[PDB]
């Protein structure tokens, strides 16, 4: 297996197959291993980036996850004043196996490369949570807050979906 983005060392986490062959995917069990400190002697900090819309996040998210659905907010939070360390790891996800998480992962890498001298990176190790929140919640509900799940297509949130789509950079 290839080294992480700055070619400094191997990827730390065990990976699973996902839709995008160019990206690294992890299972809910691995996400729990991170949250429970199984990698605490090696990983200084990790950020779970929930790429879903605010109403989805508010209806139930993984504990400690940060809601960054807009590119400009993800860039501001992660790259204005980078989270320095040991390893720093980013995990991106959306509702299931859609494009919001993968697109944000690629965007952050593009911006990280742009602000550095090749091959140095602020975030060399990034993963996608396989199956997203839809698959994580039924496996580990106590690692979520609140203990619920609000789908993107929720019937009472059609206007909120529309309102938020109009805040994105491109459609
Ligand atoms: Cl955006």
Swiss-Prot record:
Its subcellular locations are: Cytoplasm, Cytoskeleton, Microtubule organizing center, Centrosome; Cytoplasm, Cytoskeleton, Spindle pole
Q: What is this protein's function?
A: Tyrosine protein phosphatase which functions as a dosage-dependent inducer of mitotic progression. Directly dephosphorylates CDK1 and stimulates its kinase activity. Required for G2/M phases of the cell cycle progression and abscission during cytokinesis in a ECT2-dependent manner. The three isoforms seem to have a different level of activity.
Q: What is this protein called?
A: M-phase inducer phosphatase 2
Q: How is it modified after translation?
A: Phosphorylated by BRSK1 in vitro. Phosphorylated by CHEK1, which inhibits the activity of this protein.
List every position bearing Phosphoserine.
81, 170
Task: List the range of the whole protein covered here.
Answer: 391 to 564 of 580
Q: Which residues form the active site?
A: 94
Residues in Rhodanese domain copies: 42-145
> What does the subunit section of this Swiss-Prot or TrEMBL entry state?
Interacts with MAPK14 and 14-3-3 proteins.
Family of this protein: Belongs to the MPI phosphatase family.
Q: Which gene encodes it?
A: CDC25B
């Amino acid at each position: 297996m290839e080294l992480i983005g700055d070619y400094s060392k191997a990827f730390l986490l065990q990976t699973v197959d996902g839709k995008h062959q160019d990206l690294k995917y992890i299972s809910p069990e691995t996400m729990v291993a991170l949250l429970t400190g199984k990698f605490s002697n090696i990983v200084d900090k990790f950020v779970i980036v929930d790429c879903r819309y605010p109403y989805e996040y508010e209806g139930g998210h993984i504990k400690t996850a940060v809601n960054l659905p807009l590119e400009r907010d993800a860039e501001s939070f992660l790259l204005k004043s980078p989270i320095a360390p040991k390893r720093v790891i980013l995990i991106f996800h959306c509702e299931f196996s859609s494009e919001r998480g993968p697109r944000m992962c690629r965007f952050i890498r593009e911006r990280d490369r742009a602000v550095n001298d090749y091959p140095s990176l602020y975030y060399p190790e990034m993963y996608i949570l396989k199956g997203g929140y839809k698959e994580f919640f039924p496996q580990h509900p106590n690692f979520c807050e609140p203990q619920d799940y609000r789908p993107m297509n929720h019937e009472a949130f059609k206007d909120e979906l529309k309102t938020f789509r109009l805040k994105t950079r491109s459609w």
